[PDB]
Design a protein around this ligand. Sequence first.
Ligand SMILES: CN(CC#Cc1nc2c(N)ncnc2n1Cc1ccccc1)C[C@H]1O[C@@H](n2cnc3c(N)ncnc32)[C@H](O)[C@@H]1O
Ligand SMILES: CN(CC#Cc1nc2c(N)ncnc2n1Cc1ccccc1)C[C@H]1O[C@@H](n2cnc3c(N)ncnc32)[C@H](O)[C@@H]1O
Ligand SMILES: CN(CC#Cc1nc2c(N)ncnc2n1Cc1ccccc1)C[C@H]1O[C@@H](n2cnc3c(N)ncnc32)[C@H](O)[C@@H]1O
Ligand SMILES: CN(CC#Cc1nc2c(N)ncnc2n1Cc1ccccc1)C[C@H]1O[C@@H](n2cnc3c(N)ncnc32)[C@H](O)[C@@H]1O
Lengths: 260, 260, 260, 260
Amino acid sequence: MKYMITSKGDEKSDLLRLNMIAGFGEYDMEYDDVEPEIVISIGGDGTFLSAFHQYEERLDEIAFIGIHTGHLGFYADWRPAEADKLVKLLAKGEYQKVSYPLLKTTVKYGKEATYLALNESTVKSSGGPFVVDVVINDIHFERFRGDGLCMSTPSGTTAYNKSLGGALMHPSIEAMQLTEMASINNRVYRTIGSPLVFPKHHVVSLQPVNDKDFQISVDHLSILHRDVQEIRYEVSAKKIHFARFRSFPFWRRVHDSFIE
Amino acid sequence: MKYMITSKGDEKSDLLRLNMIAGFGEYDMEYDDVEPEIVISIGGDGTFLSAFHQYEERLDEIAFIGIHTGHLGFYADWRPAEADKLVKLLAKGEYQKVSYPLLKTTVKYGKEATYLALNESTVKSSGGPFVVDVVINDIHFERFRGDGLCMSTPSGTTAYNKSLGGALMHPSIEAMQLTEMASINNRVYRTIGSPLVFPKHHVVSLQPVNDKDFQISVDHLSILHRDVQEIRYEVSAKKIHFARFRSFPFWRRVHDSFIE
Amino acid sequence: MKYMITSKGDEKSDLLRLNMIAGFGEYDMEYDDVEPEIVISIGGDGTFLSAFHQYEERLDEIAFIGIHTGHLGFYADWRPAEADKLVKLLAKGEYQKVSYPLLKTTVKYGKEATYLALNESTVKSSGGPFVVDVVINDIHFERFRGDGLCMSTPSGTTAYNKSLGGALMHPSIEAMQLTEMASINNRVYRTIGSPLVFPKHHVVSLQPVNDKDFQISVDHLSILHRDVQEIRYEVSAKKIHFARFRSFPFWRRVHDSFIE
Amino acid sequence: MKYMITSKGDEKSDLLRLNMIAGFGEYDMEYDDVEPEIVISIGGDGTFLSAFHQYEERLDEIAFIGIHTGHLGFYADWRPAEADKLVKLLAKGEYQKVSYPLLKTTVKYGKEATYLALNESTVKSSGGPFVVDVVINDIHFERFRGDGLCMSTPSGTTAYNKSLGGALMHPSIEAMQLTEMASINNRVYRTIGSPLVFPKHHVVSLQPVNDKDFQISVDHLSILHRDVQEIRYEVSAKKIHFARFRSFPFWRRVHDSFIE
Ligand SMILES: CN(CC#Cc1nc2c(N)ncnc2n1Cc1ccccc1)C[C@H]1O[C@@H](n2cnc3c(N)ncnc32)[C@H](O)[C@@H]1O
Ligand SMILES: CN(CC#Cc1nc2c(N)ncnc2n1Cc1ccccc1)C[C@H]1O[C@@H](n2cnc3c(N)ncnc32)[C@H](O)[C@@H]1O
Ligand SMILES: CN(CC#Cc1nc2c(N)ncnc2n1Cc1ccccc1)C[C@H]1O[C@@H](n2cnc3c(N)ncnc32)[C@H](O)[C@@H]1O
Ligand SMILES: CN(CC#Cc1nc2c(N)ncnc2n1Cc1ccccc1)C[C@H]1O[C@@H](n2cnc3c(N)ncnc32)[C@H](O)[C@@H]1O
């Protein structure tokens, strides 16, 4: 079948990419980075995120695989020594597929633009103070004033969400988690403080109070959005598909990264 | 149909209970606290928890209702002034049912005992230091040493789970959340720190390291368990059923309790 | 004696400033914003911070006073109705002086520049990831990677330091507190997590690892510093002097702002 | 001079204690556990705490030393291999003294009892809910409701205080820090949340609201106090004296215990 391989760009990843292509050359596998069915990432989770956004238009027909040349990543969970055995099983068919939820971000101005996040999406202020009204299902919830907010996917809870005090959430749960960035709480300003976990079809809407310019990030991508009228968060109907060949539980993957 | 009413025990709740019984006396409704189909709680969330555990053997045929004489509770979300209108709709049939997940706790000795929690279940030490090995799906995760642990239901996240830094989780998500109580983290002792959210069929197992006596709590109930071999946590197959007559969203109920 | 008054710039503060000047016109008081001995701030704590930095060169001969037209500030702790009684006591001499510690920030390039902070000083990254080596008294302590750091004065602990989880510290303690901004902690990156309180003569030094550009803030002021070789933090030998006329304890001032 | 040595009680500590006594036998040193001037602790920080409370009546004439047979302690900061060199310098006189602050706890009933803490003192509830009014310098500050409170010494900030989110505070600062244990914060109950650092002569007073029984701890010691009218916290006028022979900074001691 059709496949493609992306690389971190260093000596270790580039020369491992060529060995897998040569190994695939001994099989009925066609290299194609236009319409691939298998996308292989070699490097780190940052390299994997680039491979995801590079093909975020054909998610429902691509099975992603990650090989970490450095340390164990949550998406790149295949050691380089296991790459030769990876080429064989990936060629003989016969492998399962696992899917993770994604976050959909919509930004309205005064043309509406939408984005797709595998880790999280954050909103910060462009210079001045960050003040937004938080609306959950057309109901005003709180007037947040702090450094920013962060809406995370399940698999993204181990990333930026974790540093903000958020909970680690198993990827089989179709949900999204919102966390606070150094919120202000006194007599006049009051926020919830706690992280919030929203199920599918729950729409969280951020709306400006004074300044209408925001620095919005989607995974590694981050651009200053001007004259923002609304930012909408919701669990996307799209899902990212992984190719599994063995048992590597999520909590087992959490233990190796943070415990030992 | 058959119904029963429990009361906090003060002047305000007892005399409101008699007015509802008299109002039910004008309908085809039979008072019965043996096999009731409608359980009405008047007082606070503490009174509601007693009504839940009083009939936790007939959950699948009881619709719970809560009336708060004090402040707004998350389970007692009906003002006393709305009690007269509550008697009418509850008698003419025609009402929906909403269900919340529950937590199943199993304790093994050396006879196994099981419990059911609507809020959360906590484990603390009987005097000495608290040290337990945490096992997730037969896989060792961490050796916890601190004050204790807390496994919370979705609707219980707004209670003890919130005070421990846990995330607020919508009740439509069939899950359970584990939080830490003043954990120790240095060079030799390392825990995850973050709250963990487990889906259905995930079994979290606590196992003793030295002391085998623990102070285990299930909602308000708490008893010292002796010679404990294992404590097992999992999302229960049972669900608590509420009777709804209007729209009172969970996040709307969170806003009124913590924001204003 | 010589005095000057600064204003927030709105109707309430400007017209209260003129009434105090007219009240001072009935006394042996000379208005002078070149070499004043009494600096009066009318507005909020933000207006007070501007009055402090406007005369941070003559701290040891100025007694600051704050009048809050809005809500109670920690530096502007005089209600506008008490302004007439403030003019009288301020003219008849006979008032005490209280002093608060300050933070000294030094930035080295490759000309060294120094700053003075009444609240706190923060370091963030200019776009890329924030990675700095933390050095305490010429000893390497940790390699921090996160969103940034914040070194706070005692009176500044109730501001940005509080939102980052820092401790509230009484101003009579000559110290400085450092807090973390969404730090990363896994197997390879490890920080202390806890806030650190340093006494006088303790020098905390931040040093770059890769990117040498940082966004450094001192109270409201914040500018991008290019080609930074070192940032040094230490409790300044200078102190800000307040004029007191009554008893308004710090914890009493904390209670009114955050409790009720 | 007069000296005594206490031991953890295992093979490693008991047989190291006898070697130091034999080494002291070659000098003008008299073993005496009645009126010693040098107290040597061999084991861990727990063994050191017992040595402190064993002689807390003669603090101003005792220089404490700690030898850790296990891992590096904050009070036992001498490796067992350095014990032979410790006997020589300790005999030839010529060593400096460093002093750490202590916490004074007073409990009133209806006879007043006082205690001395090197690490911290905690208050918890005897079964029922924990509710106390917090009073700072005869001024009501907050009505706390949670699991308990913890007042820590400077050197105790690295212990229980750290697990509760408290700040790490250098021992040269004569202060005390109060932290919260899973406090409740909603519409009706509001606490400060942040840790509080009090200087000398500041008196923090806890007073019961309903239940007058409390489980009070002082370092390892903890006893149930009945019919409590007041608990008073303040920085003690007494100080614990250490004998130093080299440079081992506090932050350097923090780095080795928590970073590497
Ligand atoms: C760097 N880009 C690729 C990735 C990834 C990733 N994702 C992960 C995941 N899900 N689990 C475990 N490691 C994951 N990595 C590896 C990793 C990256 C940074 C720090 C530590 C690990 C984008 C990621 O920059 C992050 N980030 C920014 N500020 C952060 C902070 N203050 N704290 C944690 N993250 C932070 C957000 O995560 C963003 O998406
Ligand atoms: C008191 N008994 C009935 C109830 C309830 C409830 N449940 C609620 C819920 N889900 N949301 C909102 N209010 C809820 N209340 C009302 C409420 C109770 C205590 C404090 C604040 C509110 C049992 C509850 O004693 C709690 N608890 C103990 N130590 C706590 C702490 N340190 N922090 C928050 N709780 C704590 C656990 O919650 C336990 O179950
Ligand atoms: C706004 N400028 C004047 C001031 C002040 C001040 N100082 C105070 C103090 N010491 N105590 C109590 N209120 C104080 N105010 C009033 C106040 C200001 C902002 C938010 C709440 C209150 C500069 C202040 O912008 C802050 N800031 C930025 N991001 C913050 C956050 N995420 N959280 C709290 N602060 C934050 C830092 O504090 C900076 O110095
Ligand atoms: C065990 N007894 C001797 C000691 C000490 C000490 N003091 C230390 C210090 N200052 N710095 C570094 N290590 C210190 N140890 C070693 C250490 C002890 C326990 C856990 C980790 C280390 C009494 C100590 O039982 C503690 N404790 C209880 N519950 C705790 C928690 N949930 N979290 C941290 N502590 C907790 C309080 O500290 C109490 O005083």
